Structure 1
């Protein structure tokens, strides 16, 4: 409206007052996305962007928040004339969705750094005329709610955002950009991307948010970073509390990434009486298995990251193998470059550093070392197998000789007597390879001294050696 009942908790004088507001909105028919995003952006501004004069919490006065809200609703109502776009069935049309998208887009500053922090919220849109990529999609959904368009909802993959709308909520529309230097498909469906089996569209197993899940998104979007070295404890606490509220009300049930975020926040600062981070990462993975065909990568990455930081090398390797086991059933497409980077860093930086330390610890007499555990070698092999299988049938290759050097080094961290204990079984520790590259590498995986040149040839399917 704002409606009288939405105004009664103001002023918000603390983290807990903001939690109160979220609880009240989540108990309504429809939580007010515009109100909530403006409040988070206000408090994030004064806790992370400009802390000058801060003494405890930046009090959110109704007059201030109501005037920002009025700025937003005036901008959207003035620019989108609904009479031009009749709604039959009480559902929206593609032209209406595109118009709202255009209005948001056309309001943005002509030039700014798109991956800056703190440009995710409606506070940023109103006060700075700046939004990040997914922020634009969220703003479209907020604007649509403000206009009464109950059918328009946020859609989220692991690296992009768009909307769903229309009869049965079955239509899709691009509303925002993706990446850097990919050309807009604003207004179009996501069906080509789904059909090509790219990671970006998750084979169709992407989140279709309800209003509560859109609240969860804006909560995950909070950015406690003050600078590279420093997070706002106040924003960490607020995000954590808001995620527990959502969790308790059931609104994280279908939101794997949110459960990973909450697990990471609990690792940093555990809440007494709550599930441990590991339980939460596993809930994230179970959510992806239950609702999204186990076609998400980040539930496993989140888990691997935790094990890595805790130097549980076996369990980290297991979880990265599981990431690869998901990616293997995708085609590597243009605009998947974020997940390629993730896999590259794991294979070529993280795993090497971990195994380097494990090697030094083994020299110092360690027992139960991953490097002496054939099931850990099997995980390493399953990780490469999934990456090789991913590559098969993709329009663009994945592996190159730069990966080969690290593979050879990583393999060699395990002694031959350990590697010999993995049984590689064919269809039709034990491991089955899905990729042709690893099936052909079987021959070389158990020699005392790894034949480096042969491994390079097999991984990159470079077929010739130097002439002279």
Structure 2
């Protein structure tokens, strides 16, 4: 049941009234995830999905929100009989967590597009019987909270979600699917994935949320997109304000991606008196270094994207080199395709486009150009080195000849006299050490006035032979 004190701010008539509700809930012992997600989903539906009749803000009446809450609590209480699953010691059992996951899963529409916008919240679950993959995990945690299961909490990697629970919160369970066409592991631990050093499970350096971080998750999960060309200004403002509320209370400290989201929002529309986007991206990286062993990729990707948008080639290259320095200590495994796609895009599309423009501007007489800076050439080489090291020891390869044409083109954007300045030093001006055997063998080829394209291709793909005839 909603408690009397949870109801006093209704009706919610504005963005600021929604912020007041979040502030009130975050001031409580246990913020009510079900209430909060139903409110966000309600307001997102009427600001992004269907804006017919909108004049300012979709007023959220208690009668409407309370009826949605009742549908959820009735579905969960009726379908999960806690007496079947006695709790030793204030903690939940694997079978109980599996039962709640089954209840959510079985409620979903038989057939729908899982990749759509606006199917993340409990409002989508109730009104449309549709959830995306992490939406199911969040719904399991919200259902568990509604049931009194204080130990069940959301776990997050950079591309997946599951739950932690049990004695000392040390158990893991899969509760949702990952990707498309992968085999389901619902009910199992994540230990095989941690042990194989995949990106998907972050070598165990994943987020273990408390209830406040679960609030931050649902706020990050707001989707302002109305269509491909249009965002809801109202939802952008709501998300931004809610993220600052969380930040001020300390609840983004251990949430690198939320800090990057907040930085991106500040870049779009700065809040007076607040830290610059750059400061916020760096806070996100600092969060990953402090709490997650610097084993997260996306803090650096957020930073590089900012530099790329501002056509700051030097700083973008630096940030992508730093991204690669993280990935080098992973094994590239079968469900890590999203981060492969990110690195492929950066190497084979984004960097080429940046350097093409830089080349034209150099022709027109630019000073201080990245293309005349040997430290920038070094960043490019460190980016490729990290990708090559990533591949070493991995069950599936990364590089192939499709990468080679772009490597040769990108190297060629720097004149030989610039390339010559980098000193490649072994273990045991600009200096660089390579970690990968591929780049060590390429060293020779990196300072010739005209790059030997064929030799580069052979070294990058460890294709051994050239054409017979």
Residue 261 (structure 1) shift: 0.1
CA shift for structure 1 position 248: 0.1
Aligned to 1:17: 17
Cα RMSD over matched residues? 0.2
How far off is 1:308 after superposition? 0.3
How far the C-alpha of 1:291 sits from its partner, in A, is 0.0
Distance 2:340 2:296 in 1: 14
**CA distance, structure 2, for counterparts of residue 291 and residue 377 of structure 1:** 31
1:398 shift after superposition: 0.1
Displacement after TM superposition at 1:450 (Å): 0.2
The size of the alignment, in residue pairs, is 468
Q: Deviations over 1:379-433 (max 9, x none)?
A: 0000000000000000000000000000000000000000000000100011000
Q: CA deviation at 1:252?
A: 0.1
Matched, 1:113 2:113: yes
Per the TM alignment, residue 451 of structure 1 is displaced from its structure 2 partner at its CA by: 0.1
Q: Give how far 1:326 is off.
A: 0.1
Deviation at 1:72, TM superposition (A): 0.2
* Helix, strand or coil at the partner of 2:163: strand
SS in 2 for 1:200: coil
Instruction: Tell me how far 1:109 sits from its aligned partner.
Output: 0.2
Partner of 1:445: 446
Shift of 1:154: 0.1
- Alpha-carbon separation, structure 2, partners of 1:336 and 1:322: 19
After superposition, give the CA deviation of every residue in 1:308-347 in whole Å (9 maximum; x if it has no partner): 0001100000000000000000000000000000000000
**Distance (whole Å) between structure 2 residues aligned to residue 275 and residue 3 of structure 1:** 37
CA distance in 1: counterparts of 2:120 and 2:408, whole angstroms: 42
Q: Distance in 1 between matches of 2:63 and 2:262?
A: 32
Aligned to 2:244: 244
Q: Distance in 1 between matches of 2:444 and 2:178?
A: 42
> Can you list the C-alpha shifts for 1:67-106, whole angstroms capped at 9, x where unaligned?
0000000000000000000000110000000000000000
Give the CA deviation at 1:162: 0.1
Q: In the aligned structure 1, how far is the partner of 2:180 from the partner of 2:315?
A: 35
1:227-267, Cα deviation, whole Å (9 max, x unpaired)? 00000000000000000000000000000000000000000
Query: SS in structure 2 opposite 1:155?
Result: strand
Gaps of 5+ in 1: none
Quote the Cα distance in structure 2 between the aligned partners of 1:242 and 1:425.
Answer: 48
CA distance in 1, matches of 2:70, 2:120: 19
Task: Deviation per CA, 1:427-462: give whole Å up to 9, x if none.
Answer: 001100000000000000000000000000000000
SS of the residue 2:124 aligns to: helix
4+ residue runs over 6 A deviation: none
- 1:183 is displaced (CA, Å) by 1.0
Cα separation, 2, equivalents of 1:436 and 1:54: 60
Compute the TM-score of the two structures, normalised by the length of structure 2.
1.00
**Deviation of residue 280 (structure 1)?**
0.0
Q: Which runs of 5+ in 2 are unaligned?
A: none
User: What is the SS of the residue equivalent to 1:164?
Assistant: strand
CA distance in 1, matches of 2:407, 2:133: 35
Match of 1:344 in 2: 344
Q: 1: CA distance between counterparts of 2:198 and 2:391?
A: 12
TM-score normalized with structure 1 length? 1.00
Structure 2 CA distance, aligned partners of 1:435 and 1:157? Answer: 26
Shift of residue 165, structure 1, vs aligned partner = 0.1
SS of corresponding position for 2:318: helix
